[PDB]
Structure formats: structure tokens, C-alpha cells
């Protein structure tokens, strides 16, 4: 009986094994666009993904992760609210059973169809496992997906999902370029928060982009065909793997734009 997204193991049960679920800096949250403070001291984000090396894609039973070689400074995020260099280690998505839910973060209570998380750890700490222990250890870039037009650069991702259908499966996934997932503008809101899965550590600077990307209905449909189970236990579709909004408590959301 370990954690998941169902009735008996879902986000509302998490606090029993992971008490920090009820903490002071839990994510995700609702971004109230009228209460967010424009802060003109924030610099533009600097995203340097030219030398990125993708290695592998896996179904870990809660999402699918595309993993990158983080042994050197090859795909890095700097600037913004960040001091220092943060290395890309993985990206993953959260998505819904239907097009009107799926994102974790909300914008004036509006849900998007999915949310992309690009996970970066602060090189000052030397590896990811030490990073998650620090208040400034991680930076995740969150990008919202709405359904409209196809995103061509997501297509290579969708075509291999057939090969990692069940929990535990993994496939070689080289030469994928994460630039094809970025929207046009890099304006953002930022606030201090947490991982949105267990262990829910409060180690994250969140950078949530204003501009959504578009994917097609057919594209998100293929995400929905994945399984939370291993081969073949009874089939449970991997859908609605999102944690709802958590209390903002004593936190300010800052915007890079007005
Ligand atoms: Cl993970
Ligand atoms: Zn995530």
C-alpha cells in the first residue's frame, strides 16, 4: 500500500507516511495573477540546453521521466531568481483523464490539460541526493499544456510511450532536444516550494512560465494509454497523476513581467 493517485492512496492520504505534506512551503499552488508582485530586480532566465544529452525514458509507476546526463554542465538553467548553476537531470509531465484537468499549478483557478516539469539541481551541492536536502537545492521549470495544435518536438516522446507501457519499463532515448518543448516567451512567476510527489521535500524554487504550449488532442491521448501497474498486473490507466493546490500560507509569488 504505498502512495499513488487513487481513492485509497491518493494525495489526501500522503501526510500519513510524509508528514511534511502539511508543511509551510508545499506545492503546487494557485497563482492569483492580481496578487502576484511584479519584481523588477528579477533577471531573465538563461536556459542553455545546446549541449543536452538525453539518455533514457522510463515509466516509474507515477509518471514517465526522460533522463539526462548530469555528470557535467551540459544543459543548465541560470538567472532568474537563481544564484548559481542548476543542472537538468530529468523532465516529466502530469496530465488528466480529460482535457480540462491535469496541471498541478493553476492560474486564477484555471486548470490546464497537462504540466511539464523540467527538474534541475544546484551544482554547489555536488549530486541530486544532496541537493534535495537544501532549501535552495532544486529549480523546476513548469510549463502548462493546452490542447489545440500539435507540438512537433513532443512527437518523438509520444511515439516511444508504446515501448514503456507498464511500471518498470525503460527504453534508450538519445538525441532528444528539450528546446522543442519551450514556449516562445520566458516570462514567469516564481515562488519557494516543494516536490509535488513524495517525499515532498521543501527544496524547490519554482519557475512557472506564463505562456502555455499547445499539443494536440491525439498527442495527450497517448499519455493516457500508459499504465500505473507493472506487466501484467490488472490494468490501471495512468491518468490524473496531479496533486491539487496547496495553501499558499506565508508566501509571495513574484512575476518577472507586468
Ligand atoms: Cl521521481
Ligand atoms: Zn512533476
From Swiss-Prot:
What does the UniProt record report as the effect of altering residue 196 to A/C/H/P in this chain?
A: Strongly reduced activity
Cofactor, how bound (note): Zinc. Can also use cobalt(II) with lower efficiency, but not copper(II), nickel(II) and manganese(II).
Per UniProt, what does mutating residue 92 to Y do?
In OPTB3; partial loss of activity
Q: Which UniProt keywords apply?
A: Acetylation, Cell membrane, Cytoplasm, Disease variant, Lyase, Membrane, Metal-binding, Osteopetrosis, Phosphoprotein, Zinc
Which GO terms label this protein's molecular function in UniProt?
arylesterase activity; carbonate dehydratase activity; cyanamide hydratase activity; zinc ion binding
Q: Where is this site: Involved in the binding of some activators, including histamine and L-histidine?
A: 90
Q: What is the effect of changing residue 119 to K/R?
A: Strongly reduced CO(2) hydrase and p-nitrophenyl acetate esterase activities
**pH profile:** Optimum pH is 6-8.
**Stated consequence of mutating residue 195 to F:** Normal activity
What, per the annotation, is the impact of changing residue 92 to C/D/E/N/Q?
Strongly reduced CO(2) hydrase and p-nitrophenyl acetate esterase activities, impaired stability of zinc binding
Which residues bind Zn(2+) per the record? 92, 94, 117
Under catalytic activity, the entry for this protein gives: hydrogencarbonate + H(+) = CO2 + H2O; urea = cyanamide + H2O
Q: What happens on changing residue 62 to G? A: Impaired activity, not rescued by 4-methylimidazole (4-MI)
Result of mutating residue 16 to E?
In Jogjakarta
Cofactor(s) for this protein? Zn(2+); Co(2+)
Q: What is the effect of changing residue 197 to S?
A: Enhanced p-nitrophenyl acetate esterase activity, but normal CO(2) hydrase activity
Q: How is its activity regulated?
A: Activated by X-ray, histamine, L-adrenaline, L- and D-phenylalanine, L- and D-histidine, L-His-OMe and beta-Ala-His (carnosine).
GO biological-process terms attached to the record: angiotensin-activated signaling pathway; carbon dioxide transport; morphogenesis of an epithelium; neuron cellular homeostasis; positive regulation of cellular pH reduction; positive regulation of dipeptide transmembrane transport; positive regulation of synaptic transmission, GABAergic; regulation of chloride transport
The record's family statement is: Belongs to the alpha-carbonic anhydrase family.
Task: Outline what the protein does.
Answer: Catalyzes the reversible hydration of carbon dioxide. Can also hydrate cyanamide to urea. Stimulates the chloride-bicarbonate exchange activity of SLC26A6. Essential for bone resorption and osteoclast differentiation. Involved in the regulation of fluid secretion into the anterior chamber of the eye. Contributes to intracellular pH regulation in the duodenal upper villous epithelium during proton-coupled peptide absorption.
Tell me the subunit arrangement.
Answer: Interacts with SLC4A4. Interaction with SLC4A7 regulates SLC4A7 transporter activity. Interacts with SLC26A6 isoform 4 (via C-terminus cytoplasmic domain).
What's the protein called, per UniProt?
Carbonic anhydrase 2
Amino acid at each position: 500500500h504505498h502512495w499513488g493517485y487513487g481513492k485509497h492512496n491518493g494525495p489526501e492520504h500522503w501526510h500519513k507516511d510524509f508528514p511534511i505534506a502539511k508543511g509551510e512551503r508545499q506545492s503546487p499552488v494557485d497563482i492569483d495573477t492580481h496578487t502576484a508582485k511584479y519584481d523588477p530586480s528579477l533577471k531573465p532566465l538563461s536556459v542553455s540546453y545546446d549541449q543536452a544529452t538525453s539518455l533514457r525514458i522510463l515509466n516509474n509507476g507515477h509518471a514517465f521521466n526522460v533522463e539526462f546526463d548530469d555528470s557535467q554542465d551540459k544543459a543548465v538553467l541560470k538567472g532568474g531568481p537563481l544564484d548559481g548553476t542548476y543542472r537538468l537531470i530529468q523532465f516529466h509531465f502530469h496530465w488528466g483523464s480529460l482535457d480540462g484537468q491535469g496541471s498541478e499549478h493553476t492560474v486564477d483557478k484555471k486548470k490546464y490539460a497537462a504540466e511539464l516539469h523540467l527538474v534541475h539541481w544546484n551544482t554547489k551541492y555536488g549530486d541530486f541526493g544532496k541537493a534535495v536536502q537544501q532549501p535552495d537545492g532544486l529549480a523546476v521549470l513548469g510549463i502548462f499544456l493546452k490542447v489545440g495544435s500539435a507540438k512537433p518536438g513532443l512527437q518523438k516522446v509520444v511515439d516511444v510511450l508504446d515501448s514503456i507501457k507498464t511500471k518498470g519499463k525503460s527504453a534508450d532515448f538519445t538525441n532528444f532536444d528539450p528546446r522543442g518543448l519551450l514556449p516562445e516567451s520566458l516570462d514567469y512567476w516564481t515562488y519557494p516550494g516543494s516536490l509535488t510527489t513524495p517525499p515532498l521535500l521543501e527544496c524547490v524554487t519554482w519557475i512557472v512560465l506564463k505562456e502555455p504550449i499547445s499539443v494536440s488532442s491525439e498527442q495527450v491521448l497517448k499519455f493516457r494509454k500508459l499504465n500505473f501497474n507493472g506487466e501484467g498486473e490488472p490494468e490501471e490507466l495512468m491518468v490524473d497523476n496531479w496533486r491539487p493546490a496547496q495553501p499558499l500560507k506565508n508566501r509571495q509569488i513574484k512575476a518577472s513581467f507586468k
